[PDB]
């Protein structure tokens, strides 16, 4: 797998400052505006779940309300239980969602699911 002509192995090594060109406009502006601390604490919890799990199966699920967080290229190997309004939808982080958010995997509304008179006299 490659993303914008860049493989995952060098994507992990490629750093925070030059993330700008490999992204789209919106998350580039979001990273330029200054990233906050709550999603840093979420990253810390995700990685703390990632350390002590044994490395021959998928680690423990990390759950949150954060629907609007930018997926880093180093997210590959996490399990995110994202809120939707009632429950936690827990989803596998494949390498293919680097440019996406967490809101489009947690849908807040259900799909919608929606005889003639005959005279006798």
């Amino acid at each position: 797998f490659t993303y914008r002509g860049v493989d995952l192995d060098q994507l992990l090594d490629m750093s925070y400052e030059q993330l700008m060109q490999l992204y789209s406009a919106r998350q580039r502006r979001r990273l330029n505006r200054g990233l906050r601390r709550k999603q840093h604490s979420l990253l810390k919890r995700l990685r703390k779940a990632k350390k002590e799990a044994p490395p021959m199966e998928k680690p423990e699920v990390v759950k949150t309300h954060l629907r609007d967080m930018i997926i880093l290229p180093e997210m590959v190997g996490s399990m995110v239980g994202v809120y939707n309004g009632k429950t936690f939808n827990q989803v596998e982080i494949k390498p293919e969602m680097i440019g996406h958010y967490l809101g489009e995997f947690s849908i807040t509304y259900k799909p919608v699911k929606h005889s003639r008179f005959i005279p006798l006299k």
């Binding site: 003639r116 005959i118 005279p119 006798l120 006299k121």
Partner: protein, 202 residues
């Protein structure tokens, strides 16, 4: 504003207005769905088409809907221009030309059904001094009651513009011996509101 204010039906629905009439997909849609509602309205037996007097068919779009399901019909019309337009549409049913108010010229106990498509709201007014509207409506209703099979069903689609016209048509129908009533499609609506005279013999 309305086609009834333009003049007589023999001369208003001429070559060019019928030519612009057939090229109107909105007219196609409304005519097919009103023809479907009219065919669903009468309680004809299933798997057995009936002998229907199609009055006011004109271009025969309702007649085309009848012929699409395997039914058969004969058409009575008053304008030759849109009659020729219907002929040019490779239509299957037969067509007759004449004034329906002078009397239906067929034998009694013949027609198992009657389909009127926008032809009863036409005749309420008079465009000639020799034509009496009450006499014309009474003669048309009496001839229609004569030619119908006893127990057949007659549906008449209309859009009256006031309650007095409906009063005259209903009193002519109830003085002609027809038994039935009035069915309105969405009475509290404006775009979807249609009027349907339903009649039978006995």
């Amino acid at each position: 504003r309305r086609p009834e204010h333009g003049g007589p039906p023999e001369l208003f629905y001429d070559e060019t207005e019928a030519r612009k009439y057939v090229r109107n997909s909105r007219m196609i849609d409304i005519q097919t769905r009103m023809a479907g509602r009219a065919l669903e309205l009468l309680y004809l037996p299933e798997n057995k088409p009936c002998y229907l007097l199609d009055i006011g068919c004109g271009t025969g779009l309702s007649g085309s809907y009848l012929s699409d399901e395997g039914h058969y019909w004969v058409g009575l019309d008053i304008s030759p221009a849109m009659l020729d337009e219907a002929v040019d549409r490779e239509i299957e049913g037969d067509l007759l030309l004449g004034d329906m108010g002078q009397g239906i010229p067929f034998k009694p106990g013949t027609f198992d059904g009657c389909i009127s498509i926008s032809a009863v709201q036409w005749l309420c007014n008079a465009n000639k001094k020799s034509e009496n509207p009450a006499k014309r409506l009474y003669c048309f209703f009496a001839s229609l009651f004569s030619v119908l099979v006893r127990g057949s069903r007659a549906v008449l689609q209309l859009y009256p513009e006031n309650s007095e016209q409906l009063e005259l048509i209903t009193t002519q129908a109830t003085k002609a011996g027809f038994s039935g009533g009035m069915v309105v499609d969405y009475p509290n609506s404006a775009k979807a509101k249609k009027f349907y005279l339903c009649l039978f013999s006995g």
